[PDB]
RNA sequence: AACAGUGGUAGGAGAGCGUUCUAAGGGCUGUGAAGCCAGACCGGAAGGACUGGUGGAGCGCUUAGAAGUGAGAAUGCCGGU
RNA sequence: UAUCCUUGGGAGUCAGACUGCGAGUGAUAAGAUCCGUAGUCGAAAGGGAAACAGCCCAGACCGCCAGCUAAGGUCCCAAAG
RNA sequence: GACCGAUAGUGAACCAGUACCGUGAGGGAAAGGUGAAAAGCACCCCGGAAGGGGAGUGAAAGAGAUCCUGAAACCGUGUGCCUACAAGUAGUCAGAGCCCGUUAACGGGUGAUGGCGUGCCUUUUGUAGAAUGAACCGGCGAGUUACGAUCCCGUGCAAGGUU
């Protein structure tokens, strides 16, 4: 029986959230929030909430106990970039690809 | 006992009671086929035929008539635009060895 | 009447990254190189389903030798032994003998053998 | 189709002695080379190793024939700009033995994985003793 | 085409230095919004067939109506008032099941108004005969006035 | 200089093994129980050493 | 005859030529034009005569 | 049936596959159309089916007709990455 | 032995390369240059010459885990003394 | 209407000669689709919110506002086979082992190892070429039409044929 969280359009990189989501991947819902919480990285919080939201979702939508839950998926996928433009030198401008995510976190029992 | 036995344009060792697929026979599915160029009989006795074995001779059922999975002959050559392409299905004749009689 | 390009140019493209499934990176994914590589495959398959039939007699030849000279023959007078005596027993027979049937073999050198004495 | 291919199940491989002593050294490799290949069994397979381990003894006593001992050079390369080192058949012979007897063998042998492999099987060892007592190797005469 | 479409006189950049492909017009075919290369233009698709092939076609197609007992003629066709039930009444009298083409010798009004809403049923007059109705509908009701107009034509 | 060719997927994935992060060092504060770094005065509790 | 089963004479209509449709065609890539030169080029030739 | 032949650039000739539209016949489709996604099927090639998933309303087949009828390359155009 | 000629429809080609032989130019040089003559390449895959359009052998409709040969080879790489 | 169907058709299906660019004349886009009906998600839970998980509406919410369908590039997650002594135009032919079970076929996936093998196109006497073109994917993108001439073929009539 699995619980799913899902922050959509996050502003983050997907290449910098995944750094954090590697972490967490499988590890015991209990450890994986102290391991955001210790972890500097912009991606934390924002996957932390997510990680507390499907906690939440687990317990309260289908009675699951919180201390037996494992993070049985975990990934982040593209979202869609906003895409602005830096003036350069000689009158020539670069784009930027201001990328968003979509973090989701699947938690379970053991 | 076995038997090395000519037929198709190449020879073909064979067992009482063994599957071989073969050239294309003339002959519809059901109808025994006798093979009489046999070169060689092994097992206990051993015929060498010179270049067969005199009297010799297997039969066999035609078990059916197909053709074998399709390969796709393309050639082409560089620079020249020069393609060709090419399907191929060979016939055979699957045959159920019956009896050697050497 | 206009003639849109529709779903005939995708189709045909599909077919050929089907053909290259299990090819290397963008071999399998992209119509361009995957297309060059079914290409290239079709060449090389044609020219290697003629080289299969040298390879298996190169094969049968070298496994001839080996068994006729433990029957103390080369394979060159084995097979001239052979000819002389009348047998048709062609490379890919005699080498299925070589390996499975030992005894059957040196029956087959021994009447090359006395063939070559005469 | 039918032709039988050997396999690492089937193949069983013999331990051979070859008395180095005499012979001359490239006509002892090539014979040796054969061996190690695997081609003088009738269920010899092109991409299998086949062939049965070797045991060379007496390597200090090849023979070589003319002025080889002292016009046979044999070179190597470093990868450092002038770094060409050489040695005579003589010098190889008196202090690298293993060494001379190794290169011509492994000079025909195959190339590839396959031929590095077989290699593997080679032994050769300077005086009239070999350490493989356990192996219960059979001693091979060369057929000329 | 290219000089058609909105837009499109400046050359669009410098003819070399940029590193772009050379470039003309915006207008271009090869540019999205550019010019068509070719295609439709109006026409007339029209054309005609010598006289003696167009009777030979209507006199080939009319005789085939006989081979095939498709030519029903009736010794003459008068209806009282202009009513669709009427004619369909008729038809099925005549055992006419699909398309049928009634040939009338003069403009009959009455016929023409009973007719029109039927599916598949076509009122002309001798004059108004043609190969492609005639091919059309499989029955040819004509009648016998009429036959003889066409006839006097024809003949 | 620029890229001679373009790198592949294969050649991308190979160069960011390494390029990873370390799970922190982290251990139980035996005042409170949340977990802190080590050697760190711990956030939660302000505990140290047994010590708030 | 029938609308749905016309037939023409045989040898009265045949299919146009499309060049540069592809290599099977044989007349893919040039056309028909050969290669180069005054005659390959869009209104290309000399002048009658 | 016999015999013979069957490499190919420029190029000539022939026979076809497929796409859009029209006509005429005959069909399919809310008990699921087109499209899309798989598959180990079929044809000498271009190609064509069958089954399942998605989809939620249109679409084949036969003969003929008409073309904006087939793309991998143009430092092609546009979009996305 | 099965071409050849006439008429008509449609072309492409006018940069050729090397090899052998007979000559010129050059220095009896050039993978040079320009002709004659035959071949191969161009437009020809396969085998040999380590690799190697033009040299040697030989012309690929397609399948076969059949056989005989050509040039070239047969101690090992690598088929065969 | 044997015209187009959102890169098409007007530049403009949409608040388009607009946005934007230019001192100015002038140049000049991109951008359609919930559902039959808003019945447009009451209420609960995590969150500051966004965004979610339930519950409801609906035939369908994997129809929830860039809301029909949703391809490829591209980015990920899980893992059946393989991979740290190996020299690779990446395939092809041979081939164990392991893992599967199909449009049922002398099956499917992976591939230790062996043999062979220097992309495609254009342009060239000759290109793997260190000559040219292409970052990739998708769409669009090039012998057509009118009127004349001539030849072949088909048809009608024929010393006549045709308007
Ligand atoms: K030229
Ligand atoms: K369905
Ligand atoms: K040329
Ligand atoms: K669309
Ligand atoms: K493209
Ligand atoms: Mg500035
Ligand atoms: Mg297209
Ligand atoms: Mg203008
Ligand atoms: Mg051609
Ligand atoms: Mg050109
Ligand atoms: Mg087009
Ligand atoms: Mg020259
Ligand atoms: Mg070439
Ligand atoms: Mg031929
Ligand atoms: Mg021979
Ligand atoms: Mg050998
Ligand atoms: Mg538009
Ligand atoms: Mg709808
Ligand atoms: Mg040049
Ligand atoms: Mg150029
Ligand atoms: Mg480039
Ligand atoms: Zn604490």
Request: net charge positive; aromatic share 4%.
């Amino acid at each position: 029986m699995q619980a799913k969280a899902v922050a959509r359009t996050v502003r983050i990189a997907p290449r910098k959230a995944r750094l954090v989501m590697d972490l967490i991947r499988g590890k015991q819902v209990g450890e994986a929030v102290s391991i955001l919480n210790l972890t500097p990285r912009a991606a934390s919080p924002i996957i932390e909430k997510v990680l507390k939201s499907a906690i939440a979702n687990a317990e309260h939508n289908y009675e699951m106990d919180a201390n037996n839950l494992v993070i049985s998926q975990a990934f982040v996928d593209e979202g869609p970039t906003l895409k602005r433009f830096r003036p350069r030198a000689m009158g020539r401008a670069s784009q930027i690809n201001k990328r968003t995510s979509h973090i989701t976190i699947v938690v379970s029992e053991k | 006992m076995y038997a090395i036995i000519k037929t198709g344009g190449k020879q073909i060792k064979v067992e009482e009671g063994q599957t071989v697929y073969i050239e294309k026979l003339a002959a519809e599915a059901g109808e025994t086929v006798t093979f009489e160029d046999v070169l060689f009989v092994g097992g206990d006795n051993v015929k060498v035929g010179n270049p067969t074995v005199e009297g010799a001779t297997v039969t066999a059922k035609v078990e059916k008539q197909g053709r074998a999975k399709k390969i796709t002959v393309f050639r082409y050559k560089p620079k020249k635009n020069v393609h060709k392409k090419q399907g191929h299905r060979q016939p055979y004749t699957k045959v159920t060895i019956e009896k050697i009689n050497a | 009447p206009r003639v849109k390009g529709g779903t005939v140019t995708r189709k045909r493209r599909k077919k050929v990254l089907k053909l290259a499934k299990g090819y290397f990176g963008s071999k399998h994914t992209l119509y361009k190189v995957a297309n060059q590589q079914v290409m290239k495959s079709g060449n090389y398959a044609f020219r290697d389903r003629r080289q299969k039939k040298r390879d298996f007699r190169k094969l049968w030849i070298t496994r001839i030798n080996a068994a006729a000279r433990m029957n103390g023959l080369s394979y060159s007078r084995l097979m001239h032994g052979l000819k002389l005596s009348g047998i048709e027993v062609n490379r890919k027979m005699l080498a299925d003998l070589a390996v499975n049937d030992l005894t059957a073999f040196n029956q087959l050198a021994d009447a090359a053998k006395a063939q070559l004495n005469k | 189709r039918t032709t039988p291919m050997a396999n690492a199940s089937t193949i069983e491989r013999k331990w051979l002695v070859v008395d180095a002593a005499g012979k001359t050294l490239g006509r002892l490799s090539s014979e040796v080379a054969a061996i190690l290949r695997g081609k003088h069994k009738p269920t010899y397979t092109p991409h299998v190793d086949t062939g049965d381990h070797v045991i060379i003894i007496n390597a200090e006593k090849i023979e070589l024939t003319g002025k080889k001992l002292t016009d046979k050079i044999y070179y190597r390369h470093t990868q450092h700009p002038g770094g060409l080192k050489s040695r005579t058949a003589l010098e190889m012979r008196t202090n690298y033995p293993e060494k001379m007897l190794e290169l011509a063998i492994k000079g025909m042998l195959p190339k590839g994985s396959l031929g590095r492999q077989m290699f593997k099987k080679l032994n050769v060892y300077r005086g009239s003793e070999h350490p493989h007592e356990a192996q219960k190797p059979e001693v091979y005469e060369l057929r000329g | 085409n290219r000089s058609e479409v909105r837009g499109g006189g400046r050359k669009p950049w410098r003819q070399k230095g940029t590193g772009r492909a050379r470039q003309g017009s915006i207008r271009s075919p090869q540019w999205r919004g550019g010019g068509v290369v070719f295609g439709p233009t109006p026409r007339s698709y029209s054309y005609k067939l010598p006289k003696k092939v167009r009777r030979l076609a209507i006199k080939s197609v009319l005789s085939s109506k006989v081979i095939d007992n498709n030519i029903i003629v009736l010794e003459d066709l008068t209806l009282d008032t202009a009513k669709t039930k009427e004619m369909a009444a008729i038809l099925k009298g005549l055992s006419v099941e699909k398309k049928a083409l009634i040939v009338t010798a003069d403009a009959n009004e009455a016929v023409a108004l009973s007719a029109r809403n039927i599916p598949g049923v076509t009122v002309v007059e001798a004059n108004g005969i043609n190969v492609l109705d005639v091919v059309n509908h499989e029955k040819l009701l004509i009648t016998k006035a009429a036959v003889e107009k066409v006839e006097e034509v024809l003949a | 200089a620029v890229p001679f060719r373009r790198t592949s997927k294969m050649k991308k994935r190979l160069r960011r093994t390494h390029f990873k992060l370390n799970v922190p060092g982290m251990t139980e504060c035996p005042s409170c129980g949340e977990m802190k770094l080590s050697h760190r005065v711990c956030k939660a509790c302000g505990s140290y050493n047994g010590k708030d | 005859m029938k609308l749905h089963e016309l037939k023409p004479s045989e040898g009265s209509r045949k299919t146009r030529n499309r060049v540069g449709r592809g290599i099977g065609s044989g007349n893919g890539k040039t056309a028909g034009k050969g290669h180069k030169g005054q005659n390959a080029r869009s209104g290309g030739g000399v002048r009658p005569g």
